[PDB]
């Protein structure tokens, strides 16, 4: 059914029109905290800010600001934190958020360098014997293990709160093959990646929300959470054909602006859910 609507839009060449309609209907809420002068250097992009109502607050006595949003999907019973790729001065904040929110997994959908520019700070250690200390938030991060596959890398990290000496295992799911321009040709490897995150327990209710980022934390990040939520609803509902990807995306856009950045990303999301639903049969 969603598949019949897909072929209709394809045959009619109307992806841009459908996407502009979503842009026009999307919620608008204030971002007064993101726009305070003191926070200018905590934001990667002037045009991507968390809403005040859904932003993640840092606890540590100070400035509580990080560019991150809680996407809480009520019917699907799934939560996600969407955030920007860390900046050189926000790696300590990023790991503070992971600690305080009790996240088990971090999902990264970009490379540190793309199109010959830096899209995110090197916020995790690359060698077991070279751990990272974040002195501003009093956290230590160690690489425990790394498994490099053709389309993704999974890392086991140990995060230690140096104040209390408590340690937690964090799983880092790194999708390494999203192309520099456009979207993937096939959704097959992105779906395999999504099922690997699911299988880890990182998305399950006994943990805090999974942390998802790309460079801005709206485009690829949006695609990941939209695809996951739609596929869950199709398993949960008596009528799986009732799942309306445009309705789900507008719901998610109540919590963070700009999720899905292009008509091509919208088309790719439809493609991933349509293919993903056939695998869950
Ligand atoms: Mg070595």
Numbering used by the authors: 2 to 282
Extract from the study:
Protein tyrosine phosphatase 1B (PTP1B) is an important regulatory enzyme for which minimally disruptive architectures for photocontrol could prove particularly informative. This enzyme, which catalyzes the hydrolytic dephosphorylation of tyrosine residues, helps regulate insulin, leptin, and epidermal growth factor signaling and participates in a diverse set of spatiotemporally complex signaling processes. In this study, we used a protein-based light switch to place the native allosteric regulatory system of PTP1B under optical control. We sought to place PTP1B under optical control by using LOV2, the light-sensitive domain from phototropin 1 of Avena sativa, to toggle the conformation of its α7 helix.
